[PDB]
Amino acid sequence: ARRILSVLLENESGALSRVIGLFSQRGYNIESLTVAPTDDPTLSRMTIQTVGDEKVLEQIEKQLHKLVDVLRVSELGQGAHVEREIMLVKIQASGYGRDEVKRNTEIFRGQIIDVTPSLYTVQLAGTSGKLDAFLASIRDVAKIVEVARSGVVGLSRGDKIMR
Amino acid sequence: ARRILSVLLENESGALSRVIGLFSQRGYNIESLTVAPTDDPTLSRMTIQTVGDEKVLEQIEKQLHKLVDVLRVSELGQGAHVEREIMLVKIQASGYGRDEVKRNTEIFRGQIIDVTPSLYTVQLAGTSGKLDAFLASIRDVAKIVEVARSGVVGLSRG
Ligand SMILES: [Mg+2]
Ligand SMILES: [Mg+2]
Ligand SMILES: [Mg+2]
Ligand SMILES: [Mg+2]
Ligand SMILES: [Mg+2]
Ligand SMILES: [Mg+2]
């Protein structure tokens, strides 16, 4: 009931609208989406995380191919793949809590990118589950003031290449 | 030039489609877009990076405040802020180029997350400029085969 689609799309104004518009017209759900330029045959690459019925989630890919700005579409889960997200989290802590936040940041291989006497801003990259586990490890020991999270970026492993 | 908006919105489309529609109907360049779930199962946070078009963006933003599915809107480029991105880059990595890719990954403090005897996939997080510099340093030396970049996310400084 969860699918991850990679899309290679021409950078033109309107292209992102047409893709999102296609989902808006079925209630194809968008759990997360990332899109940004590649090293640029003027193309961008999009990663879309969708959740719902396997039936409608399979109508998706055929319809994406109809869009003139869409160059390639690949369902990442049908082969070996990697998925990552980045998160920034501002955390207020004192005493033992500051200790725990620092320790957990080390454990999760994050880094602190801003520091005041009462606040840390932590940058963490990993799978969604890794980021969720970081939040869970500190939520009841320190105060989470704000979270900014990217949503999933994905690529196939090895010589499976969307070109 | 460069503007970054963060938007909190009720998560379905129509909602996402309505926000992005405000940009496309003006033919306004979107360079990157990220959208992810928040604490609240009903709310998403979107971050959009655009190159404009000065005051046209101002008209888009007041228009954003008028949208029923939008809860809050912020310009990141009003801090005093931190902005970061992540990229996955798959690179043809043979002979001299394999040495070079490994060395440059070390230099930029990335990490290799997939290996074959002729390919590396590098994970790199940093500012947008850091990622750009990594690609510039390698693109003429080893063949970049795939790039998946997140788009920027950000927070104010404390
Ligand atoms: Mg074209
Ligand atoms: Mg120590
Ligand atoms: Mg040597
Ligand atoms: Mg050597
Ligand atoms: Mg060495
Ligand atoms: Mg060249």
PDB file of C-alpha atoms in Angstrom, chain B residues 67-155:
ATOM      1  CA  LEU B  67      -5.898  30.055   0.416  1.00  0.00           C
ATOM      2  CA  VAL B  68      -8.265  28.179   2.658  1.00  0.00           C
ATOM      3  CA  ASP B  69      -5.997  25.071   2.935  1.00  0.00           C
ATOM      4  CA  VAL B  70      -2.873  27.079   3.911  1.00  0.00           C
ATOM      5  CA  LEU B  71      -2.289  27.483   7.676  1.00  0.00           C
ATOM      6  CA  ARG B  72       0.984  29.465   7.709  1.00  0.00           C
ATOM      7  CA  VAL B  73       3.532  30.952   5.299  1.00  0.00           C
ATOM      8  CA  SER B  74       7.126  32.069   6.013  1.00  0.00           C
ATOM      9  CA  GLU B  75      10.033  33.481   4.072  1.00  0.00           C
ATOM     10  CA  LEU B  76      13.247  31.717   5.150  1.00  0.00           C
ATOM     11  CA  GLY B  77      15.414  34.495   3.617  1.00  0.00           C
ATOM     12  CA  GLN B  78      14.333  36.801   6.435  1.00  0.00           C
ATOM     13  CA  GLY B  79      16.777  35.193   8.878  1.00  0.00           C
ATOM     14  CA  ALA B  80      19.383  34.736  10.289  1.00  0.00           C
ATOM     15  CA  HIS B  81      18.725  31.175   9.186  1.00  0.00           C
ATOM     16  CA  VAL B  82      20.141  27.755   8.335  1.00  0.00           C
ATOM     17  CA  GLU B  83      19.235  25.998   5.002  1.00  0.00           C
ATOM     18  CA  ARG B  84      20.298  22.454   4.078  1.00  0.00           C
ATOM     19  CA  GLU B  85      19.772  19.885   1.403  1.00  0.00           C
ATOM     20  CA  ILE B  86      20.643  16.193   0.758  1.00  0.00           C
ATOM     21  CA  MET B  87      21.705  14.576  -2.523  1.00  0.00           C
ATOM     22  CA  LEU B  88      22.297  11.068  -3.777  1.00  0.00           C
ATOM     23  CA  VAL B  89      24.705  11.027  -6.702  1.00  0.00           C
ATOM     24  CA  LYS B  90      25.595   7.905  -8.733  1.00  0.00           C
ATOM     25  CA  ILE B  91      28.987   8.225 -10.455  1.00  0.00           C
ATOM     26  CA  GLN B  92      30.921   6.126 -12.955  1.00  0.00           C
ATOM     27  CA  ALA B  93      34.005   5.361 -10.930  1.00  0.00           C
ATOM     28  CA  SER B  94      36.877   3.566 -12.771  1.00  0.00           C
ATOM     29  CA  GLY B  95      40.667   3.967 -12.562  1.00  0.00           C
ATOM     30  CA  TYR B  96      41.787   7.589 -11.908  1.00  0.00           C
ATOM     31  CA  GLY B  97      38.164   8.713 -11.573  1.00  0.00           C
ATOM     32  CA  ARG B  98      37.528   6.091  -8.800  1.00  0.00           C
ATOM     33  CA  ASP B  99      40.470   7.543  -6.698  1.00  0.00           C
ATOM     34  CA  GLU B 100      39.204  11.003  -7.399  1.00  0.00           C
ATOM     35  CA  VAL B 101      35.593  10.311  -6.469  1.00  0.00           C
ATOM     36  CA  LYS B 102      36.635   8.733  -3.168  1.00  0.00           C
ATOM     37  CA  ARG B 103      39.031  11.666  -2.375  1.00  0.00           C
ATOM     38  CA  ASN B 104      36.400  14.288  -3.181  1.00  0.00           C
ATOM     39  CA  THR B 105      33.767  12.498  -1.120  1.00  0.00           C
ATOM     40  CA  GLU B 106      36.246  12.653   1.821  1.00  0.00           C
ATOM     41  CA  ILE B 107      36.984  16.330   1.243  1.00  0.00           C
ATOM     42  CA  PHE B 108      33.273  17.315   1.108  1.00  0.00           C
ATOM     43  CA  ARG B 109      32.468  15.028   4.113  1.00  0.00           C
ATOM     44  CA  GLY B 110      30.016  12.857   2.148  1.00  0.00           C
ATOM     45  CA  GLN B 111      29.740   9.100   2.386  1.00  0.00           C
ATOM     46  CA  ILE B 112      29.526   6.276  -0.181  1.00  0.00           C
ATOM     47  CA  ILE B 113      26.330   4.236   0.360  1.00  0.00           C
ATOM     48  CA  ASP B 114      26.484   1.818  -2.614  1.00  0.00           C
ATOM     49  CA  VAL B 115      29.435   0.225  -4.399  1.00  0.00           C
ATOM     50  CA  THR B 116      30.018  -1.874  -7.500  1.00  0.00           C
ATOM     51  CA  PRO B 117      33.408  -2.312  -9.139  1.00  0.00           C
ATOM     52  CA  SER B 118      32.564   0.602 -11.587  1.00  0.00           C
ATOM     53  CA  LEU B 119      29.998   2.759  -9.696  1.00  0.00           C
ATOM     54  CA  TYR B 120      29.777   4.700  -6.456  1.00  0.00           C
ATOM     55  CA  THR B 121      26.638   6.279  -5.026  1.00  0.00           C
ATOM     56  CA  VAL B 122      27.540   9.219  -2.793  1.00  0.00           C
ATOM     57  CA  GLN B 123      25.326  10.722  -0.129  1.00  0.00           C
ATOM     58  CA  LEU B 124      26.100  14.392   0.624  1.00  0.00           C
ATOM     59  CA  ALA B 125      24.237  16.824   2.937  1.00  0.00           C
ATOM     60  CA  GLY B 126      25.013  20.490   3.261  1.00  0.00           C
ATOM     61  CA  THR B 127      24.101  23.909   2.063  1.00  0.00           C
ATOM     62  CA  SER B 128      22.885  24.206  -1.610  1.00  0.00           C
ATOM     63  CA  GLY B 129      26.319  25.757  -2.390  1.00  0.00           C
ATOM     64  CA  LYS B 130      28.181  22.795  -0.868  1.00  0.00           C
ATOM     65  CA  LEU B 131      26.267  20.372  -3.111  1.00  0.00           C
ATOM     66  CA  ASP B 132      26.762  22.558  -6.151  1.00  0.00           C
ATOM     67  CA  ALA B 133      30.550  22.708  -5.429  1.00  0.00           C
ATOM     68  CA  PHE B 134      30.716  18.900  -5.140  1.00  0.00           C
ATOM     69  CA  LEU B 135      29.100  18.423  -8.575  1.00  0.00           C
ATOM     70  CA  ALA B 136      31.356  21.143 -10.128  1.00  0.00           C
ATOM     71  CA  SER B 137      34.469  19.442  -8.718  1.00  0.00           C
ATOM     72  CA  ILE B 138      33.723  16.072 -10.267  1.00  0.00           C
ATOM     73  CA  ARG B 139      31.507  16.459 -13.367  1.00  0.00           C
ATOM     74  CA  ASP B 140      34.445  16.848 -15.780  1.00  0.00           C
ATOM     75  CA  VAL B 141      36.460  14.016 -14.313  1.00  0.00           C
ATOM     76  CA  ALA B 142      34.003  11.194 -13.744  1.00  0.00           C
ATOM     77  CA  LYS B 143      30.619  10.676 -15.375  1.00  0.00           C
ATOM     78  CA  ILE B 144      27.636  11.615 -13.199  1.00  0.00           C
ATOM     79  CA  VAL B 145      24.961   9.075 -14.131  1.00  0.00           C
ATOM     80  CA  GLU B 146      22.088   9.917 -11.759  1.00  0.00           C
ATOM     81  CA  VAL B 147      21.318  12.692  -9.272  1.00  0.00           C
ATOM     82  CA  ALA B 148      18.493  12.740  -6.735  1.00  0.00           C
ATOM     83  CA  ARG B 149      18.510  16.039  -4.761  1.00  0.00           C
ATOM     84  CA  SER B 150      15.993  16.922  -2.034  1.00  0.00           C
ATOM     85  CA  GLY B 151      15.526  20.620  -2.427  1.00  0.00           C
ATOM     86  CA  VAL B 152      16.238  22.966   0.501  1.00  0.00           C
ATOM     87  CA  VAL B 153      14.779  22.780   3.978  1.00  0.00           C
ATOM     88  CA  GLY B 154      15.431  25.401   6.682  1.00  0.00           C
ATOM     89  CA  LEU B 155      15.018  26.945  10.126  1.00  0.00           C
TER      90      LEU B 155
END
